[PDB]
Symmetry: D2
Subunit: 307 residues, 4 copies
Amino acid sequence: PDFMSFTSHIDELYESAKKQSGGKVADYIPQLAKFSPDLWGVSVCTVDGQRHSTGDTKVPFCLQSCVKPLKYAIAVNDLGTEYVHRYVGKEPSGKLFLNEDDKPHNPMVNAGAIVVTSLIKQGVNNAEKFDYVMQFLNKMAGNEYVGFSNATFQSERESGDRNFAIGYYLKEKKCFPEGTDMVGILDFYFQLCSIEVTCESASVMAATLANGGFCPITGERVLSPEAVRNTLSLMHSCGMYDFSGQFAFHVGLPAKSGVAGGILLVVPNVMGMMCWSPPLDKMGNSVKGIHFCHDLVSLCNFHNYDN
Amino acid sequence: PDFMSFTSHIDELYESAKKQSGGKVADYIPQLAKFSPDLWGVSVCTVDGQRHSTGDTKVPFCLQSCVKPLKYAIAVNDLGTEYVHRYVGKEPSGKLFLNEDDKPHNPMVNAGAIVVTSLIKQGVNNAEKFDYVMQFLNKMAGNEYVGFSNATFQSERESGDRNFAIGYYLKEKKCFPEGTDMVGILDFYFQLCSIEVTCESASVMAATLANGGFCPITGERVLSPEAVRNTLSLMHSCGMYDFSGQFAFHVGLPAKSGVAGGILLVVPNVMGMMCWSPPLDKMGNSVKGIHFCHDLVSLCNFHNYDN
Amino acid sequence: PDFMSFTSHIDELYESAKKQSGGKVADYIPQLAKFSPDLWGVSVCTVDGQRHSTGDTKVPFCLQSCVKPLKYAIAVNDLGTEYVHRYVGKEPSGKLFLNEDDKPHNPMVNAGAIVVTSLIKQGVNNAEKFDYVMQFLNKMAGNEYVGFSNATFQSERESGDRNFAIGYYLKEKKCFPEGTDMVGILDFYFQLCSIEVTCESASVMAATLANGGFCPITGERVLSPEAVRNTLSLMHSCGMYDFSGQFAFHVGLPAKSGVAGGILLVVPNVMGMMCWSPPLDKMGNSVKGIHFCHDLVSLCNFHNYDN
Amino acid sequence: PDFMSFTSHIDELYESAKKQSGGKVADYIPQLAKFSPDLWGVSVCTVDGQRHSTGDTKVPFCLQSCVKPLKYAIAVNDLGTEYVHRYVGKEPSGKLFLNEDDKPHNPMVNAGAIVVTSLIKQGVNNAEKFDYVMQFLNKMAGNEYVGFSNATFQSERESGDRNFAIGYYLKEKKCFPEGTDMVGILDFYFQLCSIEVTCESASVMAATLANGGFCPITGERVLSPEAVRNTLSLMHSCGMYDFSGQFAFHVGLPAKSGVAGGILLVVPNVMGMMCWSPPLDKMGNSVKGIHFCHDLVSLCNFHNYDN
Ligand SMILES: O=C(Cc1ccccc1)Nc1nnc(N[C@@H]2CCN(c3nnc(NC(=O)Cc4ccccc4)s3)C2)s1
Ligand SMILES: O=C(Cc1ccccc1)Nc1nnc(N[C@@H]2CCN(c3nnc(NC(=O)Cc4ccccc4)s3)C2)s1
């Protein structure tokens, strides 16, 4: 409807969330600790292609866990639901690495994302694999900003002892397809987490998922309907770490958060969004972003089961 | 759109699911073991009021766990989200009785339903409490069949040792509101499970939830929008026992199953349904009903994230 | 050897432990909250019959969990290792009520003691059952003080919601022998916990276990060698609540603590002891008693693996 | 007493256990699968130095987990109870890698042994560390057979994905002393597991523990009394994998089993023993060895709490 009046509300919601100074910027690597707690940006991209931005929407930041639903969508687009879910589950967990079937709980947890990473473009080397994913992300963003943080990659690889423990654990329990270089897969996993985006480019990626796989700025089909439906289902139940259950109840929208302070939000057949503010709460979610998401659903009535 | 052609498809889906002879009729009490495995009925009730039935849709059966979302909707309608969720959670579990906050995981598990039962019409005796719930269920069904099985009630009460263990456990951990007769609450809980419905009357109850709290045959407001949205959210993630996660992924519709073989299904702003076939699978869900639900979403594209 | 010099050391150890004012007297029932934190008594009874007492050794207090190894010894004496352990385990746990075989972990936990209680003198009523156990305890104490607290019994029964939850849970999982009145068994369980002893009489009970089932003051055989060996094994690994593992490592003696502040200690083929001080630590063990036990083993070198 | 008559009983017990053909020889590496299921040897070495052997007592086999109590005894001998237990627990577990304090449950589990390995001779390289342990083992065996299997070492290192997952997990949770080369510690761990012994030499090692740290054939003090007492306590409760609880109850002797089929058994102030038969049961313990241990305690009454 009237997009001009909608932007005035997005600005009001941005201003209300801006007053939330709580949270702690992630500091496990210097590449995250660097960031200012005052950084806050909201970008909207509708299914029709209408754009609106407010705040620090052109400052690049790492996708981190926000890439998990994207690399999962590529795996389903290329291999289908059946092949992918032979290796990874489709529901949240109650932490342990595997479920009762010796499979990672879902693609939104580290163990699940490491296994999904092992399914994408099997056979070729990591350089070709990375280019393949980058090309897919470029199409999803409509050729907008998609970069890479070598400093983040080197730091994640050097300090990722928990991810190496997950790696050897999955190797022991035969979780990867036959003939997988586990360490090479971890390198590719760290590379994908280090991919940089801005609120603006990432809002187009979420808009592609909100428009059934079609990019709203190019009209091009990037992902299959099967891939989008699966990704949105798992974003609705597993996207916000331990807050996933409460986010499904109070917000009810497919979303995915990252340690850099990003929250990739999808409003089915309406719009794509990307909120970003580095200070995270006890669950690891953006404080300003979680506040904004609660206000957006309460104002525009976007909830899955809102009449 | 064309309802006449839609019924032809409902009949085809009914006929396909009829060929599924697997499952085991519940036998923990004689009142359930009595039932024929061949009983199979599907009833539809749209938001506009259009009805269609196929099979054994007039044979009464107990709601059992299908009442859990209904008594939860009454609690939220009368007390609001905040009061209710001080006593019960809003997400599934990974079994234990309480979560990390000494609260039952969600209203769709026995411990959660026992606590919800303790919130409805506090102060009055069980006879007034039961009449209050029956009146609400009558309004939800549009004054259609809502009965009671005294044989089921007596049997559930005499053999419900697990529910008495849950009862004393919740009493020890101070889960009920101050001044609660725990045993009286268990009696009321067993009474609610023993309420009988037919596929036809129960399809109107699910249609009230699909029509934002308005009964499609009376036009009357039965439940508040807050109550309906909460009930549908928890039916989407906790309604099908251990199959809840897989049902959210493959079907993506608010539904609730019972040990009598019933599956109360809701299609938001479209229709209400009730499938019933006594033989249950290893998860405790109706074999014919689960098969029908998968076929319905694959044919009419009713999934939450289907474009 | 020289008993006169040994008593001087027992008095020194008593005086050192007396300075430990920490802990909290149990207050879940008024019958325990009543007790003074300054009460502290140590009684010794050697295998030869030599006695020594220091402090409040004639003030009666409830056995509480200190009765658990005693009622277990009666069950093995009458039914044998094989019959008893068909219903209860023989090792500690990592809380849940049952192990992977749907059996309580060991006889020193509430669920294990409730099941052991259901094996003693089956067939007769609770009045005959209680007299049978009291007669056994009298023989174990050499006809010394063995009383009963009706106030404790009434209070434990009225507030024992956790024990009723355990009771119905064991009934559901078919843990009791066929034809058991679960509620009657709980009544008998509460009665056994309410049996009163003094440090002096209880030291003779521990001396019977230290003298292979023979009472050191009467010379009479009370328990079979099979019963004593089993009881001592389980006291060594399960007797001190969550501190059992640390007590096995640092003290290495068969012991059992109770909520009244008692610690029934056994020194194989040497002596029986009973320490009592109502203030308990975070694990539920007597602060003065735990301190005394560590000092006794460090001074006299009584540890199981001390050369 | 009469050693000549005792050997006749050891031979009878050997012959009875020889008839037990059940079990499966470990096959995760070819170096274990190689072994014959018919291999069976029992060696005795008393505190006085009296020796007796029956069966395949001169065929070398890897210590494997039988080295865990030995390397733990060296750590306590050099660093004391307090320093060692800052890094590792002192009790069994209910599998997870760490306890509630982010410490491995006990030194008899892989995670506990890897951490113990990181405490021995810190500072020097792995070649000096290995020589230090070998020298200690030589003194414990009275200069008898102590060798090394390079084939086992290479195979354990190449296939030890579970141990590498444990390694990175302990590194993430800061379980090792500051400045530890985790991979170098894993190499040393694999080397210690690959040390070879015969029933004869290993019976002298167990006799040193049974003689309070003194080697019965040399009279030399190898381990401190504090080290021996701690090792024996943890062998009594954690030495037989998941059968530890049942072995403590029915046998009640400090013992430690290995995947090669060895069971290092200690009889305090009486004798040291080593039973070996490659076929293992579902718990990972030697079938012939477990049978022999039950018969030995039933015949000679060696149990900890046997009068
Ligand atoms: O613990 C928490 C939360 C928490 C977290 C941190 C600190 C404090 C509390 N909440 C609980 N709620 N209810 C609990 N106990 C129920 C009642 C008895 N029971 C069992 N009795 N026996 C059981 N046995 C098993 O669960 C083996 C099993 C193994 C395989 C297959 C089936 C069962 S559970 C389950 S605990
Ligand atoms: O078990 C199953 C399924 C299953 C079911 C039935 C039979 C067989 C398998 N799957 C697993 N996946 N991953 C597992 N282990 C990981 C790796 C090490 N780890 C921990 N190491 N230490 C831990 N410690 C804790 O979890 C205390 C704790 C307590 C309070 C707060 C935090 C932690 S978990 C967790 S197990």
